[PDB]
Amino acid sequence: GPDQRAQKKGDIILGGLFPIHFGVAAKDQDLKSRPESVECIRYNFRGFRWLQAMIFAIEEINSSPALLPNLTLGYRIFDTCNTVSKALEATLSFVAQNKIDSLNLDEFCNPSTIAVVGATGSGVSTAVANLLGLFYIPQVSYASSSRLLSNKNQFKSFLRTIPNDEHQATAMADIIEYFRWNWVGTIAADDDYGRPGIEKFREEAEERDICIDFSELISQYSDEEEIQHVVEVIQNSTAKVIVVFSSGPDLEPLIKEIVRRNITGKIWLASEAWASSSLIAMPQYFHVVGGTIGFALKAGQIPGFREFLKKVHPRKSVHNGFAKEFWEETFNCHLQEGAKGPLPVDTFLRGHEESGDRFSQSSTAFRPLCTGDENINSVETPYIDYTHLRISYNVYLAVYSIAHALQDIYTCLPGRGLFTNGSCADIKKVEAWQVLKHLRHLNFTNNMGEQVTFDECGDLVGNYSIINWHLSPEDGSIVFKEVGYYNVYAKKGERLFINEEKILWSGFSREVPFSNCSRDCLAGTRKGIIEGEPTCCFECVECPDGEYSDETDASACNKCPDDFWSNENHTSCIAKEI
Amino acid sequence: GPDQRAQKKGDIILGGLFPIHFGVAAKDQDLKSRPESVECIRYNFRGFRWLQAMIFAIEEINSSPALLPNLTLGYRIFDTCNTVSKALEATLSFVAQNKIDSLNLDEFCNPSTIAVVGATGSGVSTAVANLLGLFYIPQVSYASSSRLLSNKNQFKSFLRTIPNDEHQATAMADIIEYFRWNWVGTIAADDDYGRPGIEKFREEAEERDICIDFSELISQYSDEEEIQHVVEVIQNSTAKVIVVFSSGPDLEPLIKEIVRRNITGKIWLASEAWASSSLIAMPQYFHVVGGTIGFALKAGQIPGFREFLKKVHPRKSVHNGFAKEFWEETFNCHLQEGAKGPLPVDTFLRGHEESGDRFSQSSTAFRPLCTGDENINSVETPYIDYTHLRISYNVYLAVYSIAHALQDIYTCLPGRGLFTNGSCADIKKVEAWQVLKHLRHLNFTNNMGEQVTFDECGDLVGNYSIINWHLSPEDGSIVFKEVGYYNVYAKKGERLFINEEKILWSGFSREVPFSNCSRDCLAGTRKGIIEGEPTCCFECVECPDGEYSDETDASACNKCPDDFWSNENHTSCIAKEI
Ligand SMILES: *[C@@H]1O[C@H](CO)[C@@H](O)[C@H](O)[C@H]1NC(C)=O
Ligand SMILES: *[C@@H]1O[C@H](CO)[C@@H](O)[C@H](O)[C@H]1NC(C)=O
Ligand SMILES: *[C@@H]1O[C@H](CO)[C@@H](O)[C@H](O)[C@H]1NC(C)=O
Ligand SMILES: *[C@@H]1O[C@H](CO)[C@@H](O)[C@H](O)[C@H]1NC(C)=O
Ligand SMILES: *[C@@H]1O[C@H](CO)[C@@H](O)[C@H](O)[C@H]1NC(C)=O
Ligand SMILES: *[C@@H]1O[C@H](CO)[C@@H](O)[C@H](O)[C@H]1NC(C)=O
Ligand SMILES: *[C@@H]1O[C@H](CO)[C@@H](O)[C@H](O)[C@H]1NC(C)=O
Ligand SMILES: *[C@@H]1O[C@H](CO)[C@@H](O)[C@H](O)[C@H]1NC(C)=O
Ligand SMILES: *[C@@H]1O[C@H](CO)[C@@H](O)[C@H](O)[C@H]1NC(C)=O
Ligand SMILES: *[C@@H]1O[C@H](CO)[C@@H](O)[C@H](O)[C@H]1NC(C)=O
Ligand SMILES: *[C@@H]1O[C@H](CO)[C@@H](O)[C@H](O)[C@H]1NC(C)=O
Ligand SMILES: *[C@@H]1O[C@H](CO)[C@@H](O)[C@H](O)[C@H]1NC(C)=O
Ligand SMILES: *[C@@H]1O[C@H](CO)[C@@H](O)[C@H](O)[C@H]1NC(C)=O
Ligand SMILES: *[C@@H]1O[C@H](CO)[C@@H](O)[C@H](O)[C@H]1NC(C)=O
Ligand SMILES: [Ca+2]
Ligand SMILES: [Ca+2]
């Protein structure tokens, strides 16, 4: 398929899809001549690291004698540029051999892909899944978390090492329940993410008897006026706990304004989409957004990866086409055409110093020089300058899923096969649909000792890492301290586990905040219903003359003995002086 | 003047001019509206280092109690962008106060610059000098080496810590003389550099009895045909020694072709313009260009400079306007608007990962993020990745020239002043023309222990460092090993001093090559003139019958005694058997 790729031979081929670029250029095709392939514009260092996580896991699988012995895992990895078009150009190459000809007569004419890792965006994954589904080629996504992809009617071969965004709303309710709060506020992104998330939360909240004071919608494109309203809505409210179902871009305008007005009290309940978002996790914002409790993807650990990442070289990395471009973008240089060794960067450019130079002639020619001798462990790029592996880990975990599903094919005995009936699959003549069947019944142990099995819908039955926003003493930046986990496999109530001692409320407090509508009614008063306000909002109605309320949180005052009467402050009855 | 600059207050102001950019953008001004200032395009890390050499020397002058005590040296440094226009915008600001008003009535209306450091290109310096000359403001250039600037009729206030390109041609002849060679070839750039250089060399060569076999002209814009001819001209010639008066760009096409044809023998005599040129000093080329002997600017040593260079910060460097742009270009990031601390580079860009993203909207917005916490000692840029200080040293040496000329003003006693007669100059009321007078009579000792005094024409009476092209064993690149010096102050013959032991001919030979037209005539033969060929091309004519040649290099054969006759091989006469 596409010219630029990361390809290596093997007995079984694995397809990769990664956003090495954030998008494609806005070229208006003249159509005056045969249109040429659009060019990808913003370099993604993180995306290239995700691509390396696939290669590394394959190389680790091939080195390990235990896993897939007498087999070589081969790969064909392309750049999606976060666009459906580029991602489909790649998918067509994966799909090409498999059944395209099987449907058509072209078989009379003339490298089968059995599984595909990817993609990042839920939009891109949907487009890829529509094509891979026709031939039942399994697709294991590392970052697409939209609830729409769970539909096994539409997506026949879709799987993901990332959990569905639905469970997050039920999880939020479980935390409100745990810290015994009944007065909350909701903020949502005015999109297919925030809206159903807050709606699902609203359903779960009313079930656990949690009342919502306010429900507001936000966007990245909201007016100064639209933001001013929500800010007032939060300020006017007595609820400290706010549940936010937004992304970093959509929530950023509102947060900027709350940081502008220095509104400290609020204790944030972060949605996965912004819980680890560095757009919000900014040190200038800690006054407001400090001590935020959120959901993250488990920060996995891949040993020897940092070393393998450092091993990249444009000449030495023969199976990585993107290695030259990476080198070129990480140093901002037009790499030397021919040979080593070290030479200054100016080399060509110093030609501009000449008094016989250009008038827009050599400016388009003379570019910074790369020898290939530069050290990458030096430069500050998201490639090596990273704190946690979450997506890189899901790319890792994605490859292993396919390897273990293939190992299950290799392992089964002729009477214990899944296929009709007891029939095992030939690993030499292995088909994509067979790997899909094995991936559905897959149960394997992670390289971190965690059980990795898939749901009916193809989602990873996995944990959400409960993280807390602390400020580093040494560093001076926001730190995501893991204070718990959310197991979606466990039964209702047994799904959540948090270590309160590890939490720092608002970023400094060590005592769990109060976020109930009305403070508990004392002795001398009873609970009174407030008209208009919800069930959890009560009035502390003083006991009538001749009645007393013994304990706190009393529904009604008790009448006193015929001979006795209420004391002055209605705590208990006293004897009538006769 | 211009908005962006490096400015600091002081008792006396020094003007700086540096190419922080290689040029300006090719904008065709619509003229449909008031044209806006053209933008500078290619970032020059080396140029910014040269700018730092000025600041560092000023800061070192201010810290040292010996030099200019009770005075603060102030500066106003601008970016020339290697263009006359940008360099003139700056110069106008320097010139502004001084006499512009003095000529005109505007004095009735409302920071004097006494000396200017710069510029790089001979073209730019000429344009600056034409303006500074009207007000006699001294200009000390660090890189402009054109012979045209020596004209004190045109350039009244021009000086330079770089020597004039003229002496180089006489120096070349002195080397040919030293290694006792008479058969050479010449190659020149078809411009105002190569042409007069080779012509001046041709004059000096004929004086020391050096014959030139071929004289060819080259360009960076020469045809494949034009280069093929010169290559043949060199190949067909018997001369090993070739004298090249070219720049790296102009000589590069010819060198590429000589490297293509693997012509090893040739021993190159490099002109300053290409002697240290990394465009030619490439390891792939060593087969041809190995052991090149050339002229360099003395590789000076500035202690504590590397430390000061590392001290740069966009926030912390308050007097350096270019510090933010440097930071931005050395990391390729749009620096954070407000505050610290460390944050990932993606931050904004990771917003492209969202499924509700742009169509050429956020692509123009989302840019890589800089915290200001990044380490510069890491990144491979010509700013810190440098081997020798030649131009940076001339910028250093330029500032010191002005400081010592000012110290001479401060030091003189009321009867020993240069001015009419014995009159000293008031340092509190110091004028630019007074500093110029002191710079002309300047004699001071360098921070390396070298005498720094200026010629009548304003050139630095300084050495040319004789360097040799060796290949590094550890590194694997071209090394410029200093094998001598060329003192232009010394008298004819006593100007040159080279250490033959330090030289490696062709890059490996330890024996001085043969580059004479004809090999010395032996015993039995005499020297015979070849018609058409020059004086140094001789024929070894065998002695006639009855004549003998006793020793080697004989002008004619001697007749034998009347009784005796020539021996068979004419070495000496033998007795006639009677
Ligand atoms: C808030 O209300 C809940 C109701 O379930 C209760 O458990 C909690 O203790 C209340 N908070 C206080 C401080 O009384
Ligand atoms: C409270 O909210 C209303 C709208 O819901 C708004 O008009 C008002 O300004 C807010 N704040 C105060 C101080 O009343
Ligand atoms: C919050 O905002 C005000 C605005 O004037 C500012 O002065 C104050 O320093 C801020 N609070 C803190 C603790 O930064
Ligand atoms: C294979 O097993 C399935 C599941 O029990 C059943 O539907 C099918 O009829 C069996 N086939 C045979 C050959 O018995
Ligand atoms: C297999 O899957 C079942 C059901 O999810 C689970 O109980 C079991 O622990 C998994 N692993 C093993 C080793 O049985
Ligand atoms: C979640 O945590 C439990 C307990 O540590 C573990 O068994 C499970 O496998 C983890 N989930 C994932 C995604 O591996
Ligand atoms: C009731 O009144 C007495 C006497 O003033 C006082 O000491 C007590 O605190 C009051 N309240 C309660 C809750 O007993
Ligand atoms: C080359 O000619 C010069 C003439 O001055 C002479 O000194 C030198 O020795 C000659 N070379 C040889 C090898 O004879
Ligand atoms: C020598 O030079 C002439 C032109 O000067 C050229 O025609 C010829 O090809 C060159 N080489 C040989 C091998 O004669
Ligand atoms: C010079 O050129 C030839 C061209 O075929 C090449 O094979 C040879 O290796 C070169 N010489 C050296 C020593 O590199
Ligand atoms: C000052 O000295 C110069 C040089 O000797 C001379 O031309 C000039 O006339 C002298 N002036 C006086 C006042 O004697
Ligand atoms: C001053 O200049 C003269 C002439 O160039 C020179 O001989 C002398 O050494 C210089 N320095 C001193 C300290 O006299
Ligand atoms: C040249 O070298 C001599 C001897 O080391 C020294 O006196 C002279 O000052 C040097 N030239 C320069 C440019 O300083
Ligand atoms: C002269 O001839 C003799 C006898 O053949 C020989 O030994 C000698 O080398 C010849 N040449 C010279 C330079 O003497
Ligand atoms: Ca993707
Ligand atoms: Ca300049």
Numbering used by the authors:
A (entry chain A), B (entry chain A): 21 to 130, 136 to 603
Give the original sentences from the paper that presented this experimental model.
The extracellular calcium-sensing receptor (CaSR) is responsible for the maintenance of a stable blood Ca2+ level. CaSR is a class C G-protein-coupled receptor (GPCR). Ligand binding to CaSR takes place within a large extracellular Venus Flytrap (VFT) module that consists of two domains (LB1 and LB2). In addition, CaSR contains a cysteine-rich (CR) domain that connects the VFT module to the transmembrane region.
Form I crystal structure of CaSR ECD represents the inactive configuration since the VFT modules of both protomers are in the open conformation associated with the resting state (open-open), and the interdomain cleft is empty. In addition, each protomer structure contains one Ca2+ ion and three SO42- ions. The inactive structure of CaSR ECD shows that subunit association in the resting state is primarily mediated by the LB1 domains. In the inactive homodimer, only minimal contacts occur between the LB2 domains. The inactive structure revealed electron density at site 2 that is consistent with a bound Ca2+ ion. The inactive and active structures share a common Ca2+-binding mode at site 2, suggesting that the bound Ca2+ is an integral part of the CaSR structure. In the inactive structure, electron densities revealed that anions were bound at sites 1–3. The anion at site 1 is coordinated by the guanidine group of R62 and backbone nitrogen of Y63. Second, the anions at sites 1 and 3 appear to stabilize the inactive conformation. Binding of anions at these sites prevent favorable interactions across the interdomain cleft that promote VFT closure.
